[PDB]
C-alpha cells in the first residue's frame with residue numbers, strides 16, 4: 001500500500017579536518033551506505049570532506065528535491081558539536097576552537113524538513129563529539145583514541161557496522177532503527193562510549209523498501225531531479241591518438257560524487273617508436289592536485305582503496321578528490337614522451353582533454 005513519489009539521498013562524510021583530529025571511518029561508511037541505498041532505488045549523492053559553504057549548498061540542493069510524497073534520506077558522518085541544547089555538524093574547514101556560526105545547525109535543518117510534504121524524511125547523524133514524517137537518528141560516539149584499539153583504517157564506525165546489517169530489510173523505518181539500537185545495546189564495546197537516540201513523528205507505515213509511484217516531475221522540478229540522478233554518471237572511456245601513432249586509453253572510476261579516479265595506459269605503440277610513457281598534468285587549480293600525488297603505479301598510492309575491484313591493472317592512476325570545487329569544464333593535459341628507434345632525442349607531445357563537468361560538477365552549486 002505505501003508508495004514513494006521518488007527516493008533521494010544525500011550522504012556527507014567528513015574526515016580530513018584542517019584544525020581537528022582526522023577521522024577514517026566516514027570514508028568506508030559513506031561508501032557502503034551509498035551502495036546499500038542505491039540497491040533500494042535511491043538516487044544518491046555522496047560527498048566527502050566538505051567546507052561550511054559546500055555543506056550548506058549541498059543540503060540546500062537536497063532540500064529542493066523534497067517535493068510532496070518524496071522519500072528523502074540525509075546522512076552525516078564526522079565531528080559533531082553540542083552547544084545550548086543544539087547539535088552542530090562540523091565542516092572540514094572549521095577553526096579550532098569550535099564556533100557555532102562556522103557549523104551547520106541540525107535543529108535548523110529539521111525545521112526546514114518539517115515544512116516539506118515528504119512521504120518520508122530520514123535524518124541520520126553519526127558524530128564524534130502539518131506532518132513531513134521525520135525519523136531522526138542521532139548516534140554519538142565521542143572517541144577513537146578512547147577505545148585503545150588499533151583500528152583497520154578501512155574499518156567501519158559503530159553505527160554503520162550495525163546499520164548496514166539491517167538497512168535492506170522490508171520493515172517500517174522506525175522498527176528497523178529500533179533493532180539497530182538493540183544491536184548496539186548488546187555490544188559490550190559500546191557501553192558508555194556509543195549512544196543512539198531515535199526521534200520520530202512517523203504517523204504511517206513507511207519503509208525504505210517502498211516502491212516508487214507515479215513519479216510525475218513538475219515543470220520547475222524536472223532539471224533538478226534529472227541532474228541529481230546523473231551526478232553518479234562517469235565520463236566515458238576514451239582513446240587518444242597522438243601524432244607519432246601512439247594510442248593512450250583514458251578511463252574513469254568513482255569512489256564518491258566528488259571523488260573520481262583517472263587512469264591511463266598505452267594501448268598501441270607503433271614499431272617505429274622504441275620507448276614511450278604517458279602522464280596526466282595541468283589540472284584546474286581549484287582542484288589542488290600536486291604532481292607528486294598524480295600518475296601512480298597503484299590506486300592505493302593515490303589514496304584510493306574502495307574501487308580497486310573495478311580498476312584495470314597496469315595503468316597510471318590519479319585521484320581527483322575535490323570535484324565540488326570545479327567551477328568550469330574539467331580540462332587537463334595528456335602528455336606523451338617518446339623516442340623513435342634509431343634516434344637519441346626524446347620527443348614530447350601533449351593534448352588537452354575536456355571531460356565536461358563530471359559527477360557533482362553537473363549540479364548548479
Ligand SMILES: CC(C)(N)CC(=O)N[C@@H]1COc2ccccc2N(Cc2ccc(-c3ccccc3-c3nnn[nH]3)cc2)C1=O
Pocket residue numbers: 022023024025026029077078079126127128141143144145147150151152153154155156157158159189
Ligand atoms: C563519526 C564516526 C566516525 N562514525 C564515529 C565512530 O563510529 N567512531 C568510532 C570510534 O572508534 C571505534 C570504536 C569501535 C569500533 C569502530 C570504531 N571506529 C572505526 C575506526 C576507528 C579508527 C580508525 C583509524 C585507523 C587508523 C588511523 C586512524 C584512525 C582514526 N583515529 N581516529 N579516528 N579514526 C578507523 C576506523 C570509529 O571511527
